[PDB]
């Protein structure tokens, strides 16, 4: 079962402090990007992309850098008031052609800047 897990909570951070937003997956299949968004709607802002392999042209290449291969956490350094909002870690399938197709999402983590 593919699930994307983010902590269910609110982190409150002073402007200028940093925070890490956690996201883990139960599977790396099917292949495709994990992208982070802030906010709501079709114009949700893209924040960070774990793009990964050039699939399906390549099907056998993976990231060899992680402490844990199911982790997709991001660090927001020196948070600003503009960074307040709910962040979503979203899993896509990289199909034959673009755009990528969303298939799963975490439930969101709120950042409140004090």
Curated annotation (Swiss-Prot):
It is found in: Membrane. N-glycosylated. Glycans are attached at residues 22, 60. Disulfide bonds join 23-89. Residues 1-105 form the Ig-like V-type domain. Highly expressed in cerebral cortex, brain, spinal cord, cerebellum and spleen, and at much lower levels in kidney, thymus, heart, lung and liver. Within the cerebellum, highly expressed throughout the molecular layer, and in synaptic glomeruli in the granule cell layer. Detected in neurons of the hippocampus and dentate gyrus, and in olfactory bulb. Not detected in Purkinje cells. Highly expressed in the plexiform layers, optic fiber layer and the outer segments of the photoreceptor layer in the retina. Highly expressed in macrophages. Immunoglobulin-like cell surface receptor for CD47. Acts as a docking protein and induces translocation of PTPN6, PTPN11 and other binding partners from the cytosol to the plasma membrane. Supports adhesion of cerebellar neurons, neurite outgrowth and glial cell attachment. May play a key role in intracellular signaling during synaptogenesis and in synaptic function. Involved in the negative regulation of receptor tyrosine kinase-coupled cellular responses induced by cell adhesion, growth factors or insulin. Binds PTPN11 when tyrosine-phosphorylated, except in macrophages, where it primarily binds PTPN6. Binds GRB2 vitro. Binds FGR. Binds JAK2 irrespective of its phosphorylation status and forms a stable complex. Binds SCAP1 and/or SCAP2. The resulting complex recruits FYB1. Binds PTK2B. Interacts with TRIM2. This is Tyrosine-protein phosphatase non-receptor type substrate 1. The chain holds residues 33 to 146 of 513 of the full protein.
